[PDB]
UniProtKB/TrEMBL annotation, chains A, B:
It is an enzyme of class 3 (hydrolase). This is Maltodextrin glucosidase. GO terms for molecular function: alpha-1,4-glucosidase activity; neopullulanase activity. The gene is tvaI. Residues 126-515 form the Glycosyl hydrolase family 13 catalytic domain. One of its GO terms (cellular component) is cytoplasm. The record marks 442 as: Transition state stabilizer. Its EC number is 3.2.1.135, 3.2.1.20. GO terms for biological process: carbohydrate metabolic process. InterPro entries: GH (IPR017853), GH13_cat_dom (IPR006047), Glyco_hydro_13_lg-like_dom (IPR004185), Glyco_hydro_b (IPR013780), MalZ (IPR017069). Pfam families: Alpha-amylase, Alpha-amylase_N. It comes from Klebsiella grimontii.
Length: 598, 598
């Protein structure tokens, strides 16, 4: 017995106020009855399915059911219950289940979809502003929390482990504006910036002013110019939102007493209850870093300040003149009340809600190195940096390592089971906007982690653009900068072409062009078709189009592909890689990734 | 490689403000390092474990870690990461995982435990008041929604399919008080009543007055007497809370215009927005039943009425003079705003919160025929009627059927995988108070569903008292009444001993005595030890005590039990059943359930 279904056309269709669901079956002992188990207002329905007269493909029987859309919540959960005279079987996103699947791991489709529908059409690019580009028409000071002065470096000076948070290479926002032709050439349609608000450090998560741009990055006018320039090029712009904590130099806290009335040294401070202090007066902070005092969201006036009121921080940067396209939420998982994560989901949902109030298509997504499913399944944020669902599976399959840099020996079965299990908890519209990356400012460069297996790096690039979700390039990855974690993952961008991997850059260019050309790589479902040892083969499915991806991490080999109704096409046109498909046989060169259209 | 851990002593220990975690391992290629992956304020920690010098059992190595309890939220999630030089492995509630488990499916322990700690010490009994017992010192009317008069029946009159919701056999609350010696003899320490508030029907989910007891059941004084009588016997008392909808005869709605100002026929009614009406004025209801108009919890005045204020319905019955022990929430999953389940979790959490405000140890648990995990993992209710986790697994394994009465052919592997997978999403303190039952007023009697396999009924009884959770007896099950779903599952209780299965009653009596005698059956962890085909063997573990349960649904057979450090005891004392254990060999008679102590 075999089955096929994906939460997208050709399997689902919306007519009037109904959602038609179609299931494909093949085998010698097919069920005479099939139930479409759909959920309406958390009540499980037993919707009868009927056999379609026309076979969609040779040897395949089609069953069809309807979901009434006039009632119930937008997220449409459903699964298939195959019925024999003496037994039953479930078909789910994770194949066949002999016992009922988790309610939150069925197929799911958001109708109507109130999410930011533009995210799926994007190719993101993360910029650590100080290390990207100095402007054409471009000063030390004492970093109190660091204990020494900041140090200015020449753009070609090697990056040392000393004074990591106080070393500035001078990149600014106008330098980003001046390099927009490069980014547009690469295929980038959206930018995510690390913190750019007034802050003493170089990374600037130690926020000192949530209402002004740091002058070193060019100040308010540089960001307003970048917003106008990105709008002209039709490019989206996301700012880094640091709301779990402030900087200890912020006026609300002011450990260094740069003014008066700060909560650190004044018990009668107006913001004394915006932080959590010991009976002896030491402030709670983020993971022991005294420069990042944790904000206490039990305060109803802090809530009003951050997202509650019309004049709040979250909404301030989403309206004119700023009109940013949303927030990337830093430490989204620990934000809460009383020095910890109490009521975390309630405040994250309130942050997102305030964002959509000012900007209905605002995009709010948080940094989750862990399991983000409880946040996403409660709709407290639009998406999440998909470390559990994409990044760390690739770190293990390709780089033999994980989040803690512990050894990892996983094959294709474990990797796709890992990857398919995570998606199973998400609706299709959620999967299409999951924020996928290979590395960031908070990790070692993925090129470094590959070690002796750098040759696999193109495979992860092809994978980054073909797995469900939106791709994000960490600045410099496309030209091949490497290095270990903070501070060495933030090298200055090598603008000298002799210091650039031009072949890696062209691969990034081709993949974004393929994603822009084919709807399946932006809206299509995803069926893993082969996952054994060194080889992974999946297909994207949208309407009548298909995109086949075949990734081989090891030596050259052949893989026979069983006949599948998903793969019944006029023919395949190789668009990328050196693979070859003929009569269901996959000839894959060593360390290869290949893509097919039609 | 083998591993053992359960979220209870002897594996966990609380000293000062630390939680010591101990892991057992055995095998030829053990990991030189083990990480205790514990979560603190949603941040995953890598707590190093150290090898203990003393082997807890022959061939077993013990690793130990600490969890700092002074910080973080009460629920302590954790799992084990085995570390080799080239690979890693996870040990979880669901054995070994080659890829990281779901954050919500790790081991979990609530420290401190703010839940109702008395629930684990209970043996529940559900009473459909009209069908239980007529009082010693004991009248028709027109049922508007039914269209005919109510019909009174003699206690020995057969139960027909006619006028199901209007047929009264006359049982009342004083009849429950008079039969407390019987219930106490059975082992019952807590009562859950079907609705007893003023309502025209016999089941009385069509609530007409949330502030008075229906006179047919004896009125206010009968309930107040029952509360005093249960308190005297030290018996807990739970009332049925119907808050998703009211009865259409309620004053707030008043379809039959028994007064004036009702929302059904008055657009200017004060409660017009407590329900959802069409543009042409037909009210939203529960699954098409016009007699159950759905309440719209978007109304801030309805919220104040149900649970918001001090004088609200939820809190009214939890304070003097009533002082009930909590609420069983009817249709907990659909309660929400705007005719559906919008913001369902927020209002359920608010209902529970209001209950604990009036009564800190109040017990709030809802009727979940489906997957309740999202409700429980968000702590919006203390527990749930465990149909997905216990009932329906037993319906399939023993009665070859499920919730929709569709055929089911599942073996011991699928059943325990089903049962263990569900518990995995719950903390140990949550598992101990899961509300387990075999049937209810809303299902066919489990004795009937067994069909030709009635002989398995004792096995489910032993199982009902030995699986983690609190057991609930549907009235009459202990004496063997059968019948199909509503209206035939609500037969009058047979008080004539000639109409009673005395052997089934004694088995219920013995199981409650065993549960009262042994802490492991009330507080102990649970490890499934054998689950193949017809045989299930699990063990309850508390401190140094063990309770072994061996259930055989099929023909007589022998099963060899591998040596386990969990089973290394002085010896086993058979306490129930005809099984025999000798030299790790289990001699199980056909259709048998056996229990061992020590």
């Amino acid at each position: 017995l075999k089955a096929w279904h994906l939460p997208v056309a050709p399997f689902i269709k919306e007519q009037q106020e109904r959602l038609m669901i179609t299931l494909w079956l093949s085998g010698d002992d097919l069920p005479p009855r099939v139930t479409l188990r759909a959920e309406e207002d958390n009540e499980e329905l037993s919707l009868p399915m009927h056999r379609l007269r026309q076979a969609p493909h040779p040897g395949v029987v089609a069953w069809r059911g309807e979901i009434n859309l006039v009632n119930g919540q937008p997220r449409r959960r459903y699964s298939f219950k195959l019925l024999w005279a003496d037994r039953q079987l479930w078909f789910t996103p994770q194949e066949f289940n002999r016992f009922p699947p988790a309610r939150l791991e069925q197929f799911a489709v958001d109708l109507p979809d109130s999410g930011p529908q533009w995210v799926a059409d994007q190719v993101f690019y993360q910029i650590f502003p100080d290390r990207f580009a100095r402007s054409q028409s471009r000063a030390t000071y004492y970093h109190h929390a660091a204990g020494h002065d900041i140090v200015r470096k020449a753009w070609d000076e090697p990056l040392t482990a000393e004074a990591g948070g106080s070393t500035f290479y001078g990149g600014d926002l106008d330098g980003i504006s001046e390099k927009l032709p490069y980014l547009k050439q690469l295929g980038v349609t959206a930018l995510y910036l690390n913190p750019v608000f007034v802050a003493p450090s170089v990374h600037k998560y130690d926020t000192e002013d949530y209402r002004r741009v740091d002058p070193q990055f060019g100040g308010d006018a540089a960001l307003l110019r970048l917003r106008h320039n990105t709008q002209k090029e039709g490019m989206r712009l996301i700012l880094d939102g640091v709301f779990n904590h402030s900087g200890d130099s912020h006026a609300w806290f002011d450990r260094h007493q740069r003014g008066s009335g700060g909560a650190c040294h004044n018990a009668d401070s107006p913001w004394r209850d915006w932080y959590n202090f010991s009976p002896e007066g030491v402030a709670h902070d983020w993971l022991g870093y005294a420069s990042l005092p944790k904000l206490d969201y039990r305060s109803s006036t802090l809530i009003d300040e951050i997202y509650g009121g019309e004049d709040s921080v979250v909404r301030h940067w989403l309206k004119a003149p700023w009109s940013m396209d949303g927030w990337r939420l830093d430490v989204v998982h620990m934000l809460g009340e009383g020095g910890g994560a109490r009521n975390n989901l309630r405040h994250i949902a309130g942050i997102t809600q305030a964002a959509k109030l000012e900007r209905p298509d605002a995009f709010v997504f948080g940094e989750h190195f862990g399991d983000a499913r409880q946040w996403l399944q409660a709709d407290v944020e639009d998406s999440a940096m998909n470390y559990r669902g994409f990044t760390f599976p690739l770190w293990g399959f390709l780089a033999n390592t994980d989040i803690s840099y512990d050894p990892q020996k996983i094959d294709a079965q474990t990797c796709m089971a890992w990857m398919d299990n995570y998606r199973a908890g998400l609706s299709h519209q959620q999967q299409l906007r999951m924020f996928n990356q290979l590395d960031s400012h908070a990790t070692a460069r993925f090129k470094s982690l590959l070690g002796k297996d750098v040759a696999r790096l193109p495979l992860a690039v092809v994978w980054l653009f073909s797995w469900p979700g939106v791709p994000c390039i960490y600045y410099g990855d496309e030209v091949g900068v490497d290095g270990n974690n903070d501070p060495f993952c933030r090298k200055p961008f090598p603008w000298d072409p002799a210091l650039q991997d031009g072949d890696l850059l062209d691969l990034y260019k081709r993949m974004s062009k393929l994603r822009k050309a084919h709807q399946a790589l932006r809206y299509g479902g995803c069926q893993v078709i082969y996952a054994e040892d060194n080889v992974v083969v999946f297909v994207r499915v949208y309407k009548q189009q298909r995109v086949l991806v075949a990734i081989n991490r090891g030596e050259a080999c052949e893989v026979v592909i069983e006949d599948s109704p998903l793969l019944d096409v006029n023919g395949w046109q190789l668009k990328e890689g050196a693979g070859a498909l003929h009569d269901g046989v996959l000839t894959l060169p060593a360390i290869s990734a290949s893509v097919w259209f039609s």
